[PDB]
Amino acid sequence: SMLILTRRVGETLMIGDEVTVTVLGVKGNQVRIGVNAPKEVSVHREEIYQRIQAEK
Amino acid sequence: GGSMLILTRRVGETLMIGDEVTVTVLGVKGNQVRIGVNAPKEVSVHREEIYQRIQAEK
Amino acid sequence: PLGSMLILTRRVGETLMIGDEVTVTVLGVKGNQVRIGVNAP
Amino acid sequence: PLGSMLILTRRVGETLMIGDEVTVTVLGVKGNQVRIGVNAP
Amino acid sequence: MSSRSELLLDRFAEKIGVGSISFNENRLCSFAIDEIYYISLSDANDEYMMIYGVCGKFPTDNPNFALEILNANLWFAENGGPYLCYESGAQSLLLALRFPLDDATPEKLENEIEVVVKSMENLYLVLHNQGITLENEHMKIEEISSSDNKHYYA
Amino acid sequence: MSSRSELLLDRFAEKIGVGSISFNENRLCSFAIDEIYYISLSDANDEYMMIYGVCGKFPTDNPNFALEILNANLWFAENGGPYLCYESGAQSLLLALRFPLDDATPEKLENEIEVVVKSMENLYLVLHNQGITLENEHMKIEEISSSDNKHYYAG
Structure with missing residues (x-):
């Protein structure tokens, strides 16, 4: 279930009860993204996480 | 005549200054010499040009 | 100024992992508007 | 395998300081032999 | 005029x-x-x-x-x-990177500062994943604390 | 051998x-x-x-x-x-420095290693003047303790 939505710079979306994602800015096709999440909730660049796990 | 005592030492030989400092010629390669120094922990050892620039920071 | 907020950069097509089962993908960008894809647990 | 010995390289014409009163200068080199200039009280 | 770094x-x-x-x-x-x-x-x-x-x-x-x-x-x-460093005067954690002035261009200076910024992003991510958030104080380097040993660090 | 690095x-x-x-x-x-x-x-x-x-x-x-x-x-x-680093496996202080494999000759590799050697000497010197001597244990690095975060440590 992939939820597709739209936000503008300065706007926010909630994921669950403890995580909020903020659209901080746009430069070209790059989006600055803010994340509020607890300590135990890890944040990863997905391509970096996949390279980590590809090495066993 | 810049140095008071001039002498020669071969690789593996030793020169003593006083009785608490020992200078060892460890190796020679080209015009650079590996030098070993045994000295008390409070006696400081410096490359003279680096010490001069430590003085340059007035 | 933003407190403990973690700030990342994501280009169109790049994905962000949150936790073990949440992913956020930048699906498109124009102006100050971006489209986001959130995979739900 | 040199223990607590302090080791440093000196080119011909470079000087080594020991304490405040002693200097050791590499004056010349031939083969495995070195000419050393020493200043000490 | 100005030095070619000020310009x-x-x-x-x-x-x-x-x-x-x-x-x-x-x-x-x-x-x-x-x-x-x-x-x-x-x-x-x-x-x-x-x-x-x-x-x-x-x-x-x-x-x-x-x-x-x-x-x-x-x-x-x-x-x-860049190098992970510690500025003892402000007690700050730094990412330090040397930028050569020969063939220097505002495009290259921006791209090297971007490298520093990208490294900061990735470090902030790693620190967050370890449950660490660094305090935000003395962020402008007014002055670097000097040391006698800096001339030997080469 | 299977690379220019082995040669x-x-x-x-x-x-x-x-x-x-x-x-x-x-x-x-x-x-x-x-x-x-x-x-x-x-x-x-x-x-x-x-x-x-x-x-x-x-x-x-x-x-x-x-x-x-x-x-x-x-x-x-x-x-x-070079970079002053800590190696978690051997709990050792070390100086790391990367060497480009383009146009690389043993003379260049030897000169870069001599830059490492000069830095080691300078570090030994400043530690001695501070009153510190490093214990000479686990000198040969046969394996480096790897960190999952290694792929993040880049710009």
């Missing part, structure tokens, strides 16, 4: 959009990248410029943290990235 | 006369320059080689020491390497 800095300021950035008594200036990242520039030598990405106040209580930062310098060395 | 290592072991040197299981080979300085080489990737100068065992008591080492990285950054 480069004014030209980079106009290209990025910050009003007027100038070096100070200690040949240091500080500014904000996208109003998020504190970058300081040092006009130390006429052959190189220093880029400092101030990450945050160094954890006063964590002895393992310094060792983890040193251990991360391994992989920063592999990737040719 | 570089073989020609370098010939030029120095350290005998037969070969990258091990983890592509880490350790040797001694002048039978004095412990240096390890890692075939990091197909584009770069890593030169590690193992200074000694990291002090266990002084926490301020880690702060001094970190502060020293400021000035090592001004002078173009």
Whole structure:
């Protein structure tokens, strides 16, 4: 279930009860993204996480 | 005549200054010499040009 | 100024992992508007 | 395998300081032999 | 006129959009990248410029943290990235990167500052994943604390 | 041999006369320059080689020491390497410096290693003047304790 939505710079979306994602800015096709999440909730660049796990 | 005592030492030989400092010629390669120094922990050892620039920071 | 907020950069097509089962993908960008894809647990 | 010995390289014409009163200068080199200039009280 | 680093800095300021950035008594200036990242520039030598990405106040209580930062310098060395450093005057954690002034261009200066910013992003992510958030104080490097040993560190 | 990095290592072991040197299981080979300085080489990737100068065992008591080492990285950054680092496996202080494999000759590799050696000497010197001598334990790096965060440590 992939939820597709739209936000503008300065706007926010909630994921669950403890995580909020903020659209901080746009430069070209790059989006600055803010994340509020607890300590135990890890944040990863997905391509970096996949390279980590590809090495066993 | 810049140095008071001039002498020669071969690789593996030793020169003593006083009785608490020992200078060892460890190796020679080209015009650079590996030098070993045994000295008390409070006696400081410096490359003279680096010490001069430590003085340059007035 | 933003407190403990973690700030990342994501280009169109790049994905962000949150936790073990949440992913956020930048699906498109124009102006100050971006489209986001959130995979739900 | 040199223990607590302090080791440093000196080119011909470079000087080594020991304490405040002693200097050791590499004056010349031939083969495995070195000419050393020493200043000490 | 100006040194070719001061002229480069004014030209980079106009290209990025910050009003007027100038070096100070200690040949240091500080500014904000996208109003998020504190970058300081040092006009130390006429052959190189220093880029400092101030990450945050160094954890006063964590002895393992310094060792983890040193251990991360391994992989920063592999990737040719900036150096993880500690500024003792402000007790800040820094990312330091040398920028050569020969063939220097505002485009290259921006791209190297971007490398510093990207490294800051990835470090902030790693620190967050370890449950660490660095305090945000003394982010503008007014002055670097000097040491006698700095001339030997080469 | 299967890379220009292996051919570089073989020609370098010939030029120095350290005998037969070969990258091990983890592509880490350790040797001694002048039978004095412990240096390890890692075939990091197909584009770069890593030169590690193992200074000694990291002090266990002084926490301020880690702060001094970190502060020293400021000035090592001004002078173009090497990097003062900590290796978690052997608990050792070391100087790391990458070597480009483009146009790489054993003379260049030897000169870069000499830059590591000069830095090791300077570090030994400043530690002695501070009153510190590093214990000489676990000098040969056969394996590097890897961190999952290594892929994030880049710009």
